[PDB]
RNA sequence: UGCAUAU
């Protein structure tokens, strides 16, 4: 009996040029039409909620296609960007070993 | 408030 975990897995997609009005539900309706959304982020600033964010798909299966369909769309008249995010950290902690053989 | 990676 081995680990037998899932394959597609959640991704953080960055979203940009979006109107100043867009929040959690306004971003997630735009991607969640293809599959399912877990969590959604909008960069938190001194002005309040910003015209820039991220979306957390349930699985890469819809995260891949969704960014492909949404990138180059002009939501609320603003040609957007969508790509895979940096998430929390760029200093990966998942695994380590003293050797590098095999 | 058009500030653009996770102030």
CSV table of C-alpha atoms (C1' of nucleotides) in Angstrom, one decimal:
chain,number,residue,atom,x,y,z
A,1,UNK,CA,0.0,0.0,0.0
A,2,UNK,CA,1.6,3.2,-1.4
A,3,UNK,CA,0.7,7.0,-1.1
A,4,UNK,CA,-1.6,7.0,-4.2
A,5,UNK,CA,-2.2,10.8,-4.1
A,6,UNK,CA,-3.8,13.0,-6.8
A,7,UNK,CA,-2.1,14.1,-10.0
A,8,UNK,CA,-3.4,17.5,-11.3
A,9,UNK,CA,-3.2,19.5,-8.0
A,10,UNK,CA,-4.1,23.2,-7.2
A,11,UNK,CA,-2.2,26.1,-8.9
A,12,UNK,CA,-2.0,29.8,-8.0
A,13,UNK,CA,-2.7,31.8,-11.2
A,14,UNK,CA,-1.8,35.6,-11.1
A,15,UNK,CA,-4.3,38.0,-12.7
A,16,UNK,CA,-3.6,41.6,-13.8
A,17,UNK,CA,-4.9,44.8,-15.4
A,18,UNK,CA,-8.3,43.9,-13.8
A,19,UNK,CA,-10.6,46.8,-12.8
A,20,UNK,CA,-10.1,48.5,-9.4
A,21,UNK,CA,-13.6,47.0,-8.4
A,22,UNK,CA,-12.6,43.3,-8.8
A,23,UNK,CA,-12.4,41.3,-5.6
A,24,UNK,CA,-12.6,37.5,-4.5
A,25,UNK,CA,-16.0,36.7,-6.1
A,26,UNK,CA,-15.3,38.9,-9.2
A,27,UNK,CA,-12.0,37.1,-10.0
A,28,UNK,CA,-13.3,33.6,-9.1
A,29,UNK,CA,-16.4,33.8,-11.3
A,30,UNK,CA,-14.1,34.5,-14.2
A,31,UNK,CA,-12.0,31.3,-13.8
A,32,UNK,CA,-14.5,29.0,-11.8
A,33,UNK,CA,-16.7,28.7,-15.0
A,34,UNK,CA,-14.2,26.1,-16.2
A,35,UNK,CA,-13.8,24.0,-13.0
A,36,UNK,CA,-13.7,24.9,-9.3
A,37,UNK,CA,-11.9,27.5,-7.1
A,38,UNK,CA,-10.5,27.1,-3.6
A,39,UNK,CA,-9.1,30.5,-2.6
A,40,UNK,CA,-8.6,33.9,-4.4
A,41,UNK,CA,-6.2,36.8,-3.6
A,42,UNK,CA,-6.1,40.5,-4.4
A,43,UNK,CA,-3.0,42.4,-3.4
A,44,UNK,CA,-3.8,44.3,-0.1
A,45,UNK,CA,-2.7,48.0,-0.3
A,46,UNK,CA,-3.1,51.3,1.6
A,47,UNK,CA,-5.8,52.4,-0.9
A,48,UNK,CA,-7.7,49.1,0.0
A,49,UNK,CA,-8.2,46.3,-2.6
A,50,UNK,CA,-6.1,46.7,-5.8
A,51,UNK,CA,-6.5,46.2,-9.6
A,52,UNK,CA,-4.2,43.0,-9.5
A,53,UNK,CA,-4.4,39.5,-7.8
A,54,UNK,CA,-4.3,35.7,-8.0
A,55,UNK,CA,-6.7,32.7,-8.2
A,56,UNK,CA,-6.4,29.2,-6.7
A,57,UNK,CA,-7.9,26.5,-8.9
A,58,UNK,CA,-8.8,23.0,-7.5
A,59,UNK,CA,-6.7,21.4,-10.3
A,60,UNK,CA,-4.1,22.3,-12.9
A,61,UNK,CA,-6.4,20.7,-15.6
A,62,UNK,CA,-8.7,23.8,-15.6
A,63,UNK,CA,-6.0,26.2,-14.4
A,64,UNK,CA,-4.0,25.6,-17.6
A,65,UNK,CA,-6.9,26.0,-20.1
A,66,UNK,CA,-8.5,28.8,-18.1
A,67,UNK,CA,-5.4,31.1,-18.2
A,68,UNK,CA,-5.1,30.2,-22.0
A,69,UNK,CA,-8.7,31.5,-22.6
A,70,UNK,CA,-8.6,34.5,-20.2
A,71,UNK,CA,-5.1,35.9,-21.1
A,72,UNK,CA,-5.7,38.6,-23.8
A,73,UNK,CA,-9.3,39.2,-22.7
A,74,UNK,CA,-10.2,42.9,-22.0
A,75,UNK,CA,-12.2,42.6,-18.7
A,76,UNK,CA,-14.1,45.9,-18.0
A,77,UNK,CA,-12.2,47.4,-21.0
A,78,UNK,CA,-8.7,46.4,-19.7
A,79,UNK,CA,-6.6,43.8,-21.7
A,80,UNK,CA,-5.5,41.4,-18.9
A,81,UNK,CA,-2.5,39.2,-18.1
A,82,UNK,CA,-2.7,35.7,-16.6
A,83,UNK,CA,0.3,33.4,-15.7
A,84,UNK,CA,1.3,30.9,-12.9
A,85,UNK,CA,2.2,32.7,-9.6
A,86,UNK,CA,5.2,32.8,-7.1
A,87,UNK,CA,2.8,31.9,-4.3
A,88,UNK,CA,4.2,32.4,-0.6
A,89,UNK,CA,8.0,31.9,-1.1
A,90,UNK,CA,10.7,31.4,-3.7
A,91,UNK,CA,13.0,29.6,-1.1
A,92,UNK,CA,11.6,26.0,-1.6
A,93,UNK,CA,11.4,23.9,1.7
A,94,UNK,CA,9.6,20.7,0.4
A,95,UNK,CA,12.6,18.3,0.4
A,96,UNK,CA,16.4,18.2,1.1
A,97,UNK,CA,19.3,15.7,1.1
A,98,UNK,CA,23.1,15.9,1.8
A,99,UNK,CA,23.9,13.9,-1.4
A,100,UNK,CA,22.7,14.5,-5.0
A,101,UNK,CA,23.3,11.0,-6.6
A,102,UNK,CA,20.6,9.0,-8.5
B,1,U,C1',-7.5,56.7,-7.2
B,2,G,C1',-3.8,52.4,-12.6
B,3,C,C1',0.2,51.1,-7.0
B,4,A,C1',1.7,45.5,-10.7
B,5,U,C1',4.0,38.9,-6.8
B,6,A,C1',2.0,37.3,-3.0
B,7,U,C1',4.2,45.7,1.9
